[PDB]
């Protein structure tokens, strides 16, 4: 009957600070310790620090000592984690987790879904959308593949649907690629019958909320 919910994703430039929050239902004033644990992509988890209830004392991992700060506002049942002088290596998934008791020496029994902070030197840019047209090179067996190239955007994520939501069965949106420019690019493909191709009209609906751009693009042979 106790749930954890952290704040939304963050995107930061190197050298800046970031302050993530974690909100607890049940509670709300705590009688359990709360910790922060990060996980770099393709890595084992890494404890950062935690905060004891009532007494407010804090313990920090040796690695983060002096540039991480953990605090709690008891009247709102919310704990904060603040990491300063960000580098690219700080890019990770950030979990809050509560302890089955009041000590950080104890099992972490409940975890939040997680939140990502991304550290990059890039600025926020909307994408360009280009059609990936069916053609004779993609037509076999009475099927045809067609799609959309969402090029050079920052940061993640982007939303691609088809015909404003109608087409779903037979739609694959590939995971993005990260170029050396520090910009993202992805592709979205819908598999459909050869016959419909000319008669049928297909439109992709790209949405990049971070730069407030919605692009709608028709894909035709």
């Amino acid at each position: 009957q106790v749930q954890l919910v952290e704040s939304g994703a963050e995107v930061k430039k190197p050298g800046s600070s970031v302050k993530v929050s974690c909100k607890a239902s049940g509670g709300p004033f705590r009688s359990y310790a709360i910790s922060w644990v990060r996980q770099a992509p393709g890595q084992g988890p890494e404890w950062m620090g935690g905060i004891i209830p009532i007494f407010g004392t804090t313990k920090y991992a040796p690695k983060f000592q002096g540039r991480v700060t953990i605090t709690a506002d008891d009247f709102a049942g919310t704990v904060y984690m603040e990491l300063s002088s960000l580098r690219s290596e700080d890019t990770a998934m950030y979990y809050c987790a509560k302890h089955m008791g009041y000590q950080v020496r104890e099992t972490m029994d409940v975890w939040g879904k997680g939140t990502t902070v991304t550290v990059s030197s890039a600025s926020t840019k909307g994408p360009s959308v280009f059609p990936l047209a069916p053609s004779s090179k993609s037509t076999s067996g009475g099927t045809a593949a067609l799609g959309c190239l969402v090029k050079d955007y920052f940061p993640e994520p982007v939303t691609v649907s088809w015909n404003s939501g109608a087409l779903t069965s037979g739609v694959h949106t590939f995971p993005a690629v990260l170029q050396s420019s520090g910009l993202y690019s992805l592709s979205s493909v819908v598999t459909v019958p050869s016959s419909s191709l000319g008669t049928q009209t297909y439109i992709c609906n790209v949405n990049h909320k971070p730069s407030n751009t919605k692009v709608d693009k028709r894909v035709e042979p």
Partner: protein
């Protein structure tokens, strides 16, 4: 600095064990937990206090600690058990912190080999008109999830300008991958044809495009 084997595999219905080794300042003198992490979820507590199991965890999960190490055990393993597994404890030295293992990835044997299907698109005309050129090679529905990708200019390879993704499990439990070749419009129109060549399980699939003929 907790050491686990990087991966472990067994068939459905059988038993596995995952070990975790450390020193006396951590595993030796403290209690070990095990956490399970399915792709894209919060880590869930499987086992605590070395061998105790929280209410709501199937009894085919078992834990044990002997001296300086601990082992997790799963019996009658079902395909839904495929995840990364982490051990965790408290280090009691002057360091004074919570320490984790490297993780082990448990995979379950048997899904049929699925040969990959490959779609290759050439640069769109509006992108060429924007003074850029991107060849896109999409690979889907292969298993197991490891392919290599090679590009060809006419008949000879090109290594420059290539970006490929890590393969990733789709929703239908097969794998997908994208590869992008970035060129100038001058280079694109400069060749007879370009080829994307996908190699999966000692078999080759190759698709071709040409500057609108």
């Amino acid at each position: 600095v907790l050491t686990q084997p990087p991966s472990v595999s067994a068939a459905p219905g059988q038993k596995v064990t995952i070990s975790c080794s450390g020193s006396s300042s951590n595993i030796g003198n403290n209690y070990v937990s095990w956490y399970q992490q399915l792709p894209g979820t919060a880590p869930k507590l499987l086992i605590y206090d070395n061998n105790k199991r929280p209410s709501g965890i199937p009894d085919r999960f078992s834990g044990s600690k002997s001296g300086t190490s601990a082992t997790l055990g799963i019996t009658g393993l079902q395909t839904g058990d495929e995840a990364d597994y982490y051990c965790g404890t408290w280090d009691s030295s002057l360091s004074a912190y919570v320490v984790f293992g490297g993780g082990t990835k448990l995979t379950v044997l048997g899904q049929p080999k699925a040969n990959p299907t490959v779609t290759l698109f050439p640069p769109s005309s509006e992108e060429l008109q924007a003074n850029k050129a991107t060849l896109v090679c999409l690979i889907s529905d292969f298993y197991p999830g490891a392919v290599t990708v090679a590009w060809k200019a006419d008949g000879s390879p090109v290594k420059a300008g290539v970006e490929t993704t890590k393969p990733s499990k789709q929703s239908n439990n097969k794998y997908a991958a994208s590869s992008y070749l970035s060129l100038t419009p001058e280079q694109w129109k400069s060749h007879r044809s370009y080829s994307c060549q996908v190699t999966h399980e000692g078999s080759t699939v190759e698709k071709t495009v040409a500057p609108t003929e």
